[PDB]
Design an enzyme around this catalytic site. Structure first.
Site, PDB file in Angstrom:
ATOM      1  N   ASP A  93      38.990  21.657  -7.370  1.00  0.00           N
ATOM      2  CA  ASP A  93      38.420  22.892  -6.780  1.00  0.00           C
ATOM      3  C   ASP A  93      37.242  23.329  -7.667  1.00  0.00           C
ATOM      4  O   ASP A  93      37.512  23.632  -8.800  1.00  0.00           O
ATOM      5  CB  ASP A  93      39.443  24.027  -6.687  1.00  0.00           C
ATOM      6  N   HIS A 108      38.342  21.105   5.750  1.00  0.00           N
ATOM      7  CA  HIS A 108      37.954  22.322   5.001  1.00  0.00           C
ATOM      8  C   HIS A 108      36.433  22.329   4.778  1.00  0.00           C
ATOM      9  O   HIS A 108      35.835  23.299   5.079  1.00  0.00           O
ATOM     10  CB  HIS A 108      38.712  22.365   3.674  1.00  0.00           C
TER      11      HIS A 108
HETATM   12  C1  HEM Z   1      44.175  27.398  -0.069  1.00  0.00           C
HETATM   13  C2  HEM Z   1      42.947  27.844  -0.172  1.00  0.00           C
HETATM   14  C3  HEM Z   1      41.844  26.970  -0.589  1.00  0.00           C
HETATM   15  C4  HEM Z   1      41.869  25.760  -1.214  1.00  0.00           C
HETATM   16  C5  HEM Z   1      43.049  24.975  -1.747  1.00  0.00           C
HETATM   17  C6  HEM Z   1      40.502  25.333  -1.264  1.00  0.00           C
HETATM   18  C7  HEM Z   1      40.138  24.117  -1.826  1.00  0.00           C
HETATM   19  C8  HEM Z   1      38.826  23.683  -1.850  1.00  0.00           C
HETATM   20  C9  HEM Z   1      38.426  22.399  -2.300  1.00  0.00           C
HETATM   21  C10 HEM Z   1      39.323  21.326  -2.832  1.00  0.00           C
HETATM   22  C11 HEM Z   1      37.084  22.308  -2.170  1.00  0.00           C
HETATM   23  C12 HEM Z   1      36.228  21.096  -2.526  1.00  0.00           C
HETATM   24  C13 HEM Z   1      35.668  21.110  -3.963  1.00  0.00           C
HETATM   25  C14 HEM Z   1      34.595  22.170  -4.147  1.00  0.00           C
HETATM   26  O1  HEM Z   1      33.437  21.929  -3.801  1.00  0.00           O
HETATM   27  O2  HEM Z   1      34.878  23.248  -4.660  1.00  0.00           O
HETATM   28  C15 HEM Z   1      36.658  23.556  -1.586  1.00  0.00           C
HETATM   29  C16 HEM Z   1      35.363  23.847  -1.335  1.00  0.00           C
HETATM   30  C17 HEM Z   1      34.944  25.058  -0.827  1.00  0.00           C
HETATM   31  N1  HEM Z   1      35.701  26.078  -0.414  1.00  0.00           N
HETATM   32 FE1  HEM Z   1      37.636  26.112  -0.415  1.00  0.00          FE
HETATM   33  N2  HEM Z   1      39.731  26.257  -0.692  1.00  0.00           N
HETATM   34  C18 HEM Z   1      40.426  27.249  -0.247  1.00  0.00           C
HETATM   35  C19 HEM Z   1      40.040  28.419   0.396  1.00  0.00           C
HETATM   36  C20 HEM Z   1      38.723  28.782   0.644  1.00  0.00           C
HETATM   37  C21 HEM Z   1      38.268  29.954   1.309  1.00  0.00           C
HETATM   38  C22 HEM Z   1      39.136  31.070   1.873  1.00  0.00           C
HETATM   39  C23 HEM Z   1      36.885  29.886   1.320  1.00  0.00           C
HETATM   40  C24 HEM Z   1      35.879  30.819   1.870  1.00  0.00           C
HETATM   41  C25 HEM Z   1      36.145  31.893   2.539  1.00  0.00           C
HETATM   42  C26 HEM Z   1      36.509  28.666   0.666  1.00  0.00           C
HETATM   43  C27 HEM Z   1      35.225  28.261   0.503  1.00  0.00           C
HETATM   44  C28 HEM Z   1      34.892  27.027  -0.015  1.00  0.00           C
HETATM   45  C29 HEM Z   1      33.476  26.610  -0.167  1.00  0.00           C
HETATM   46  C30 HEM Z   1      32.281  27.421   0.180  1.00  0.00           C
HETATM   47  C31 HEM Z   1      33.499  25.373  -0.681  1.00  0.00           C
HETATM   48  C32 HEM Z   1      32.309  24.511  -0.998  1.00  0.00           C
HETATM   49  C33 HEM Z   1      31.968  23.667   0.229  1.00  0.00           C
HETATM   50  C34 HEM Z   1      30.735  22.812  -0.007  1.00  0.00           C
HETATM   51  O3  HEM Z   1      29.631  23.357  -0.012  1.00  0.00           O
HETATM   52  O4  HEM Z   1      30.860  21.593  -0.185  1.00  0.00           O
HETATM   53  N3  HEM Z   1      37.662  28.055   0.332  1.00  0.00           N
HETATM   54  N4  HEM Z   1      37.729  24.340  -1.420  1.00  0.00           N
END
Ligand code: HEM
Ligand SMILES: [Mg+2]
Length: 301
Positions: A144, A216
């Protein structure tokens, strides 16, 4: 004649955090002095523990902020709505305290100071202790943070309001997720990777045309005429091995708009499709807050 950002928005790679969410019990006036004492306490702890690289944020919900600001600025602030007709629940409180540093023990002392400052003026609803896990992975085993804005210059650009009354301020979104790791472990690793949009071990992005629209990354990597809707995430794992555990989601942005567009996408309000992570984890809280600039906290009187 300029504004200073609160210390907890921009720090990167902090290993620990404490989030306290609370309701106001009496006259909103109680919050003016308390907030001033709290930011002073933070300055004291920063002086005593320079190697902790400590930062903190005090932020306010719509109702109390409208009262403290006299209705001026924070034009996008509103109570957190329910998304997906309830898929994302709403638990809008009045006050959010976010503490982060390289030392959980220092965080704990700062949390005690926050509680002493506000005292019986608040009713604490949630206190969550976040910790960075091995390889900065979420408890699901996926890294993450990879595409989070990097460096103070870009994080300022994304998270910090640039001018007007709110210059130095930021909008905050908090949402606690409860992971069902047993459900996740029933899924094959390839199915998990298609659910996230990145490979699990090596953390390689899966192309947009190779992964489902419910992945996601497909739900939250949003662009408007080629310009990404970026946010600064400060999320961390939390919980016990045998009890409740998951991700405490936390994001800062100059515009609440970028956060809301990602939630509408994830929870099925934009195209009728929802985030594949809902197959193993769910959100149980949700709130929007306004983090004023440090100097506006000093003009709370
Ligand atoms: C259980 C809840 C969540 C988990 C386990 C999770 C996990 C992850 C993971 C593994 C990534 C890929 C690695 C990274 O680029 O950071 C990611 C990316 C991202 N997540 Fe989440 N996330 C969650 C909830 C959320 C929520 C609620 C939002 C926004 C409202 C969010 C927004 C993002 C964004 C903006 C990225 C970057 C996407 C990109 O530009 O490639 N996430 N998240
Ligand atoms: Mg991208």
């Amino acid at each position: 004649g300029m504004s200073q950002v609160q210390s907890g928005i921009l720090p990167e790679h902090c290993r620990a955090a404490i989030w306290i969410e609370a309701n106001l019990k009496g006259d909103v006036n109680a919050l003016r002095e308390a907030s001033k004492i709290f930011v002073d306490n933070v300055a004291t702890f920063q002086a005593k523990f320079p190697d902790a690289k400590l930062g903190a944020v005090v932020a306010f919900g719509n109702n109390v902020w409208r009262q403290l600001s006299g209705g001026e600025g924070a034009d996008e602030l509103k109570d957190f709505p329910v998304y997906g007709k309830g898929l994302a629940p709403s638990t809008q409180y009045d006050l959010l305290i976010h503490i982060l540093s390289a030392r959980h023990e220092v965080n704990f002392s700062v949390a005690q100071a926050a509680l002493a400052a506000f005292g019986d003026a608040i009713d604490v609803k949630e206190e969550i202790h976040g910790f960075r896990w091995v390889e900065e992975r979420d408890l699901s085993g996926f890294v993450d943070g990879t595409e989070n804005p990097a460096g103070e210059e870009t994080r300022r650009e994304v998270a910090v309001i640039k001018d007007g009354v709110d210059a130095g301020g930021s909008y905050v979104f908090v949402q606690r997720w409860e992971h069902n790791l047993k459900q996740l472990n029933r899924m094959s690793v390839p199915d998990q990777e298609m659910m996230i949009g990145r490979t699990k071990d090596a953390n390689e992005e899966i192309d947009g045309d190779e992964r489902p629209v419910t992945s996601h990354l497909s739900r939250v990597d949003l662009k408007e005429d080629g310009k990404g809707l970026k946010i600064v995430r400060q999320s961390l794992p939390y919980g016990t091995a045998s009890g409740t555990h998951g991700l405490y989601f936390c994001a800062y942005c100059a515009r609440l708009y970028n956060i809301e567009q990602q939630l509408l996408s994830m929870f099925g309000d934009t195209d009728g499709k929802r985030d594949a992570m809902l197959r193993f984890t769910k959100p149980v809280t949700g709130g929007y807050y306004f983090a004023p600039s440090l100097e506006r906290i000093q003009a709370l009187g």
